[PDB]
Symmetry: C2
Subunit: 156 residues, 2 copies
């Protein structure tokens, strides 16, 4: 129905969506991620909502239920001797309810992030995604995103 900015009163619905994605990461990379109740710290959520450079978006359906959310950050680095000045929207979180994928919700949310980025005349949108996460990768790829760089690892 609509995409709006979240408020602090959206914590419980957002936190539930956060747990779906977090537990999937715990399952695949338990060497890095740990289970907890809650998985979303409400103080961290409050800071994201009220932060100067961060924005929390939610997709709300016709029944006033939150179906997806995203957290984004306006990032600016100045001109340096060896690095260009750069302005980006960084997506730290984007979760679509597990039972509501394939309904176009994720694309709608991403289009809102694009609109925001253009309004702020940013150079690019960026995010980070784990290699095991084929669902996320195919999603971002289908929307035109491409790999900039990667973290490589060798367990000892």
């Amino acid at each position: 129905m609509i995409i709006r900015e979240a408020t602090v009163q959206d914590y419980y619905e957002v936190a539930r969506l956060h747990t779906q994605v977090h537990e999937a990461h715990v399952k695949e990379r338990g060497d890095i991620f740990r289970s907890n109740e809650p998985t979303l710290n409400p103080s961290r959520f409050q800071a994201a909502v009220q932060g100067e450079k961060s924005t929390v978006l939610v997709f709300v359906d016709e029944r006033e239920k939150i179906g997806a959310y995203s957290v984004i950050h306006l990032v600016q680095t100045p001109l340096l001797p060896t690095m260009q000045q750069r302005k980006t929207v960084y997506i730290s979180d984007l979760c679509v309810d597990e039972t509501r994928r394939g309904g176009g919700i994720g694309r709608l949310i991403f289009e809102a992030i694009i609109s925001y980025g253009k309004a702020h005349q940013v150079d690019a949108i960026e995010l980070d995604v784990y290699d095991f996460n084929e669902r996320a990768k195919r999603f971002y790829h289908s929307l035109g995103m491409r790999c900039q760089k990667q973290t490589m690892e060798l367990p000892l």
Copy 2:
């Protein structure tokens, strides 16, 4: 041929190697990287050499030139509600002289990094590499490294 810790007196030889890698990145991703003379800040080099958690290694051979260097960091994150405790060696820089490729130098340097990681009983060695850099990616893969996660981008 030896691998030893660098000192501040190794600045110029190391800076030259840093420049080779940096200008390759300027050429391929000039949207992010910028040319400068020098590309390696000597105050930053000194801090890396003398840093509590950083180590700079150099490969010296043939009498008596530096053919490669690397900068590594001991990284420790504590147990958190949603993240496991983790200890790693992060490689922030690794440059083998362009003119000295195909001589087993990169592997020798990496083996010394592995030894360090083992002495410090770390969980993994990690690094970041740009997607355009097929040579570095293939080389790191040939050492057994694998993609953990990636940064994706969409220019606007």
